[PDB]
UniProtKB/Swiss-Prot annotation:
It catalyses: [phosphatase 2A protein]-C-terminal L-leucine methyl ester + H2O = [phosphatase 2A protein]-C-terminal L-leucine + methanol + H(+). Belongs to the AB hydrolase superfamily. The gene is PPME1. Demethylates proteins that have been reversibly carboxymethylated. Demethylates PPP2CB (in vitro) and PPP2CA. Binding to PPP2CA displaces the manganese ion and inactivates the enzyme. InterPro entries: AB_hydrolase_1, AB_hydrolase_fold, PPase_methylesterase_euk. It holds the Pfam family Abhydrolase_6. This is Protein phosphatase methylesterase 1.
Length: 294
């Protein structure tokens, strides 16, 4: 099989480094974009990943509904450069998302649907909840359930600590990511892995997720009810997570959010089964008349 790196340009129409001047100075956030019409799907990746994890999903969703895509490298991930990379509190990260949207569109933002996986799902909710994105019309969390969130992350640490510490080349990192079982979908791995690593000082991991543990409580505490309280249509996609917690079960009985079950994936279902995620998102968008089918 071919494990050579595939660039972002095979999936996104453009990319930009968005400048943001915040309390700690002047930061730059990397975004990969696509499309010209329809709602902007603002995609937030999970811990240790990057916006490139949404590459294959982007091609899949664009072929189903008329929409735009803005995949964001969160603080300390991918190619984003902040002055205080240690601060991964929910508060700061949500603020970043709002600041990025503000810088990208100013006073005339397009309709936006937040979509986040794991850590990104929590950040998506904190952002929507704090009303940091004025034009928000919908919210989606992928495999994020407060009740078991901490346990999901802890089960991962064992794997994370055992991974190779460096790779001779980007191609070897990609080959390892597939053969290790981390990324089942070869297509996604060839493009997304470049976002998970960086050149040493050979490649090494962009971030040691274990160092962010002090912020996990802030990411998930009260997240389920926080999600339910957001005054916009909502979507919960389950893949690796097999159950709702008590809060969401109650919310579901109250009809507060749409829910869909996708094929199991211990990692990122948006990388492993891009079109299944796109199909679910497209259905939701069409259901609420947020976008037109292609």
């Amino acid at each position: 099989r071919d494990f050579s790196p595939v660039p972002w340009s095979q999936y996104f129409e453009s990319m930009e480094d968005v400048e943001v001047e915040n309390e700690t100075g002047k930061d730059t956030f990397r975004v990969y974009k696509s499309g010209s019409e329809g709602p902007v799907l603002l995609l937030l990746h999970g811990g240790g990943h990057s916006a490139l994890s949404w590459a294959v999903f982007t091609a899949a969703i664009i072929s189903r509904v008329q929409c735009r895509i803005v995949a964001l490298d969160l603080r300390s991930h991918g190619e984003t450069k902040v002055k205080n990379p240690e601060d991964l509190s929910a508060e700061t990260m949500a603020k970043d998302v709002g600041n990025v949207v503000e810088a990208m569109y100013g006073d005339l933002p397009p309709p936006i649907m937040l979509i986040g996986h794991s850590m990104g799902g929590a950040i998506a909710v904190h952002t929507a909840s704090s009303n940091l994105v004025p034009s928000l019309l919908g919210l989606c969390m992928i495999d994020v359930v407060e009740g078991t969130a901490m346990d999901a992350l802890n089960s991962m640490q064992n794997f994370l600590r055992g991974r190779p510490k460096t790779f001779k080349s980007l191609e070897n990192a990609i080959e390892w990511s597939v053969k290790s079982g981390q990324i089942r979908n070869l297509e996604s791995a060839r493009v997304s892995m470049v976002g998970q690593v960086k050149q040493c000082e050979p490649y090494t991991w962009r971030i040691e997720l274990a160092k962010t543990e002090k912020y996990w409580d802030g990411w998930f505490r009260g997240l389920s009810n926080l999600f339910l309280s957001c005054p916009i249509p909502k979507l919960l996609l389950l893949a690796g997570v097999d159950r709702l917690d008590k809060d969401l079960t109650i919310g579901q009985m109250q009809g507060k959010f749409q829910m869909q079950v996708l094929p199991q994936c211990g990692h990122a279902v948006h990388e492993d089964a891009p079109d299944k995620v796109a199909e679910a998102v497209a259905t939701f968008l069409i259901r609420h008349r947020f976008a037109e089918p292609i």
